[PDB]
From Swiss-Prot:
Stated family: Belongs to the protein kinase superfamily. Tyr protein kinase family. FAK subfamily.
Clinical disorder: Aberrant PTK2/FAK1 expression may play a role in cancer cell proliferation, migration and invasion, in tumor formation and metastasis. PTK2/FAK1 overexpression is seen in many types of cancer.
Function: Non-receptor protein-tyrosine kinase that plays an essential role in regulating cell migration, adhesion, spreading, reorganization of the actin cytoskeleton, formation and disassembly of focal adhesions and cell protrusions, cell cycle progression, cell proliferation and apoptosis. Required for early embryonic development and placenta development. Required for embryonic angiogenesis, normal cardiomyocyte migration and proliferation, and normal heart development.
Protein name: Focal adhesion kinase 1
From-to range in the entire protein, with total length: 415 to 686 of 1052
Taxonomic lineage from the root: Eukaryota, Metazoa, Chordata, Craniata, Vertebrata
Signal peptide coordinates: none
Protein source organism: Homo sapiens
Post-translational modification: Phosphorylated on tyrosine residues upon activation, e.g. upon integrin signaling. Sumoylated; this enhances autophosphorylation.
Modified residues (Phosphotyrosine): Y156, Y162, Y163
Active-site residues per Swiss-Prot or TrEMBL entry: D132 (proton acceptor)
Domain remark from Swiss-Prot or TrEMBL: The Pro-rich regions interact with the SH3 domain of CAS family members, such as BCAR1 and NEDD9, and with the GTPase activating protein ARHGAP26. The C-terminal region is the site of focal adhesion targeting (FAT) sequence which mediates the localization of FAK1 to focal adhesions.
Location of the Protein kinase domain: 8-263
Compartment list: Cell junction, Focal adhesion; Cell membrane; Cytoplasm, Perinuclear region; Cytoplasm, Cell cortex
Subunit structure: Interacts (via first Pro-rich region) with CAS family members (via SH3 domain), including BCAR1, BCAR3, and CASS4. Interacts with NEDD9 (via SH3 domain). Interacts with GIT1. Interacts with SORBS1. Interacts with ARHGEF28. Interacts with SHB. Part of a complex composed of THSD1, PTK2/FAK1, TLN1 and VCL. Interacts with PXN and TLN1. Interacts with STAT1. Interacts with DCC. Interacts with WASL. Interacts with ARHGEF7. Interacts with GRB2 and GRB7. Component of a complex that contains at least FER, CTTN and PTK2/FAK1. Interacts with BMX. Interacts with TGFB1I1. Interacts with STEAP4.
């Protein structure tokens, strides 16, 4: 899993991470075609405690191998420490959705929700609780492929460090907001919010509502409204993710199967 720095061509900065800037680049793989990659850099990895924390993020991604989760390519443990990830060429999902708005076919939006449900069913199969499922952590590899982004770079995951700028209340299950309970069932609640975000073309949930007012509305039975053009079967599926009792929420394998049916019904106009 070690990569040699002379095989990396560093390109433009595509974002800022907790440990340092993230760049786009090219990895000249030995005896293979060159790959487009994302490079996580570390500014203070001279410190052993910082270096080990940064390298733990690469080990977290190394344990996963799924077509809709960004893949670890390798690490450069020489000073300055770099983590090499696969690049999702088209960038962040919210920006991509905000450009296209109604020009994206409904079949593409449902496909994105289905692809994420396969990655979340895979994480659930490994007994891994995400805790930060939101459209901001989703990347676009091509017009017909989205992926979950790096877990370390995700602002509110369990082992993620904080950025200079507390909790994503508008995405969280009631038991997570009230008692900090995070399970596979609370991940299902967040995924229903993420599906709503996709069908709303990158609009954020509960805009203009204060975080403290969200739990009162949820306890009164209020939910995010049906997005314009969203098929009623898809909205019904979202409301099942938002069952107040977590034991009544479906698991990711069921959401995957139902989304595949919804997608095939839309493709048959
Ligand atoms: C949102 N995220 C970030 N948060 C903080 C820092 C960086 C990232 C993005 N990280 C990544 N970005 C890309 N692709 C990419 C992203 C942006 C742009 C472009 C390509 C080109 C067009 C453009 O203009 N910008 N692929 C892979 C990664 C990964 F492997 F590092 F995850 S996250 C939690 O990692 O999903
Ligand atoms: Na190296």
């Amino acid at each position: 899993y070690e990569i040699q720095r002379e095989r990396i061509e560093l390109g433009r900065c595509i974002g800022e991470g907790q440990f340092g800037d993230v760049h786009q680049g090219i990895y000249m793989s030995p005896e293979n075609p060159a790959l487009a990659v994302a490079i996580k850099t570390c500014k203070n990895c001279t410190s052993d405690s910082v270096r080990e924390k940064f390298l733990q993020e690469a080990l977290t991604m190394r344990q996963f191998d799924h077509p809709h989760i960004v893949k670890l390519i390798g690490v450069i443990t020489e000073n300055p420490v770099w983590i090499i990830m696969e690049l999702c060429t088209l960038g962040e999902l919210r920006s991509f959705l905000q450009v296209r708005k109604y020009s994206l076919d409904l079949a593409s939006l449902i496909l994105y929700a289905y692809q994420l449900s396969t990655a979340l069913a895979y994480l659930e199969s490994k007994r891994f609780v995400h805790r930060d499922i939101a459209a901001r952590n989703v990347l676009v590899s091509s017009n017909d492929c989205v992926k979950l982004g790096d877990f370390g770079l995700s602002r509110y995951m369990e082992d993620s460090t904080y950025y200079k700028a507390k909790l994503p209340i508008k995405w969280m299950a009631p038991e997570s907001i009230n008692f900090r309970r995070f399970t596979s069932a609370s991940d299902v609640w967040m995924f229903g919010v993420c599906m709503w975000e996709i069908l709303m073309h990158g609009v954020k949930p509960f805009q203009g509502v204060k975080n403290n007012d969200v739990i009162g509305r949820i306890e009164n039975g209020e939910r995010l409204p049906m997005p314009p053009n969203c098929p009623p079967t898809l909205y019904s599926l979202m409301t099942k993710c938002w069952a107040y009792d977590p034991s009544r929420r479906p698991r990711f394998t069921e959401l995957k199967a139902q989304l595949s049916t919804i997608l095939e019904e839309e493709k048959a106009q």
